[PDB]
Amino acid sequence: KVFGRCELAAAMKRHGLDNYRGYSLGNWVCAAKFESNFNTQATNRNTDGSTDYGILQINSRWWCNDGRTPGSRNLCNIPCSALLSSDITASVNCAKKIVSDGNGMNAWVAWRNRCKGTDVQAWIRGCRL
C-alpha cells in the first residue's frame, strides 16, 4: 500500500509515534518519505547481505528474521515479512525499540543525512490533527 502524506501522519499519531523519545511527528513522516517513499512493500538489499524492510526500512541484521542473514539477531521477535503489511502496527512497535537503543533517530541514515536539523514541521502541514 502506498500511503498519502496525511494518511500516514494520522496512522503514526494513532499508534503513539508523535513525540516518542522527543521526536516530533514531522520527523517520523520525513524518515518514511525518504526511506520508502510511503510504500509499505519496499525492500532494499545492503552490501553486507542484510535487507531493509517496510515503510521505515528496518534491518534484518539486528531487528527481524528473513532466514538468509547469517549471524544476525531477531530483537523485535517478528518475521521480516510482517513489516511489509498494509497495517503499520508491526513497523511502529519495532521503530519504538530502535529509537530507544541509545543513538536516537541516527539509526536511520536517511533521517541523519536528509531530515535532521531541517524544518520537519512542513511534512505534517495541512493535515487535520
Curated annotation (Swiss-Prot):
State the compartments where it is located.
Secreted
SUPFAM superfamilies reported for this sequence: Lysozyme-like (SSF53955)
What keyword terms does UniProt attach to this protein? Allergen, Antimicrobial, Bacteriolytic enzyme, Disulfide bond, Glycosidase, Hydrolase, Secreted, Signal
The record's active-site residues are: 35, 52
Q: How is the subunit organization of this protein annotated in UniProt?
A: Monomer.
Q: Which family does it belong to?
A: Belongs to the glycosyl hydrolase 22 family.
User: What name does the UniProt record give this protein?
Assistant: Lysozyme C
Q: Anything further noted?
A: Lysozyme C is capable of both hydrolysis and transglycosylation; it also shows a slight esterase activity. It acts rapidly on both peptide-substituted and unsubstituted peptidoglycan, and slowly on chitin oligosaccharides.
Alphabetized CDD domains for the sequence: LYZ_C
Which example biological process does GO assign this protein?
killing of cells of another organism
